[PDB]
Design a protein around this ligand. Structure first.
Ligand SMILES: CCCCc1cc(=O)oc2c(O)c(O)ccc12
Ligand SMILES: CCCCc1cc(=O)oc2c(O)c(O)ccc12
Ligand SMILES: [Fe+3]
Ligand SMILES: [Fe+3]
Ligand SMILES: [Fe+3]
Ligand SMILES: [Fe+3]
Lengths: 264, 264
């Protein structure tokens, strides 16, 4: 029904009163579609670093873990559900930026040079969205306090800036860095899952939010375990896809067709 | 078959030299679908400015039309296909930016305030992608000179910066500034279609580029006019959508469900 008669109306401000809040509309239509007993078998991998650069990405990813563990007192206390979420929550605020700047920089090159991109730009932009939906999911499980609100904001500053220039200077470094982060992402979500299983953590969000049901297409019966596990598969996708974009950069392949447009 | 076994592999660098370059993958799959006899009737509109803001937007967008027409010898020549393609090519290198800075900002706000976006983001993201396809098409009907190829980059720098700080200060301003740009894009692309029809322009690439032919889903018999015709629809879509957004801004509805999610 989207025709020239709609196209020719000056504005549509007067229709915002009558248009529902739909949870399907929070995301773009490009949703993951994992099946659960498969992705159960996601596993902690570690790509060896080649050069200085891959190493620098590592040491700095490792240093970021160290910091964010000591200061988040993940290390001293007991694995609560409240410090698991409160942790990811913070962490998805940053997870949404290296997708987005990567897309937005590639897109500017592809405009200015006037050149085909071969479906990088969209894969990166959805990683950015995919992570944003982790954050839209975790926010439903736990609204954080003024402290964390403000630590997210200063941090976004630091990061949006670091990622913008680190990506100008070295897309290889960023894709390699995000790659290294996502190994940790996957450890943190398989550790969590190990914990639910063993019984060392008994989660009271066995309601899975409406956003997260339609986005990941799960049953209404989907447990908290399930939700970690699909997100743990999203994070494995990112682990390879950016370590793939890393290597492509390594071998001057940073303008080849993105192999994953095929491999969907 | 995108399951754990793939997700568990360190790279896919191997595959890169055996995966094809298919013109579909250049875009996301969130493609336009018009039919030509309907969007034949797309009109030239003009929204009233309310504020000193909407005014400013309008006067900036007119001064830009003036400049561009004057520095592009459009005012003093027999309209060629060359200068039509040349003007439209340059321009999509600036159309491709607002959607991208708009989208990313809304994204970064959603991440740091941990709040819903309600599907503005992905709209501004396919706003920008669509534009960039306009440019991928025009690149193929005419590869530009060095002197334009330069101008393009110095332009991007100015504009990327401008829109980034405009969009922080008043997206209402920018979304208007686009709204009033797309009014002038429709004017032109109609004029062009008139000029084909009145016989005064004899287009020589009625081979419509593969990129486009898939993107806009046209026949193999699709003419140049036919392409102009759709591109113009897209441009009039962006005209309402941005004015709507600048209208929503104006009434403090920059958090309301993007009306157009539904109208899709
Ligand atoms: C500095 C490494 C942080 C690891 C991490 C833990 C987590 O709980 O969730 C993450 C996560 O959701 C990511 O996307 C990336 C990294 C993590
Ligand atoms: C700065 C005014 C430009 C108007 C305009 C003319 C044109 O020939 O093509 C356009 C175009 O392709 C757009 O996407 C936006 C604006 C124009
Ligand atoms: Fe994550
Ligand atoms: Fe991540
Ligand atoms: Fe355009
Ligand atoms: Fe445009």
């Amino acid at each position: 029904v989207w025709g020239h008669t709609q196209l020719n109306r000056l504005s549509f401000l007067e229709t915002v009163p009558v248009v529902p809040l739909r949870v399907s509309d929070e995301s773009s239509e490009d949703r993951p579609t994992w099946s659960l007993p498969d992705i159960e078998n996601v596993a902690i991998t570690h790509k060896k670093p080649n050069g200085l650069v891959d190493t620098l990405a590592y040491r700095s990813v490792r240093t970021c873990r160290w910091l964010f563990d000591t200061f988040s007192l993940y290390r001293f206390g007991s694995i609560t559900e409240s410090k698991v979420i409160s942790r990811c929550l913070f962490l998805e605020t940053v997870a949404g930026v290296p997708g987005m700047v990567g897309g937005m920089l590639r897109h500017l090159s592809s405009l200015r040079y006037m050149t085909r991109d071969k479906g990088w730009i969209n894969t990166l932009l959805v990683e950015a969205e995919n992570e944003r939906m982790h954050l839209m999911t975790f926010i439903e499980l736990r609204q954080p306090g003024l402290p964390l609100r403000v630590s997210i904001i200063i941090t976004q500053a630091i990061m949006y800036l670091f990622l913008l220039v680190a990506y100008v200077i070295s897309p290889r470094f960023v894709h390699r860095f995000v790659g290294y982060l996502e190994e940790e992402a996957v450890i943190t979500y398989t550790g969590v899952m190990r914990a639910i299983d063993e019984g060392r953590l008994r989660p009271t969000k066995n309601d899975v939010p409406e956003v997260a049901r339609v986005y990941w297409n799960l049953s209404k019966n989907a447990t908290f375990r399930d939700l970690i596990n699909v997100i743990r598969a999203d994070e494995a996708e990112h682990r390879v896809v950016n370590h793939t974009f890393a290597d492509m950069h390594e071998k001057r392949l940073q303008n080849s067709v993105n192999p994953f447009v095929v491999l969907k």
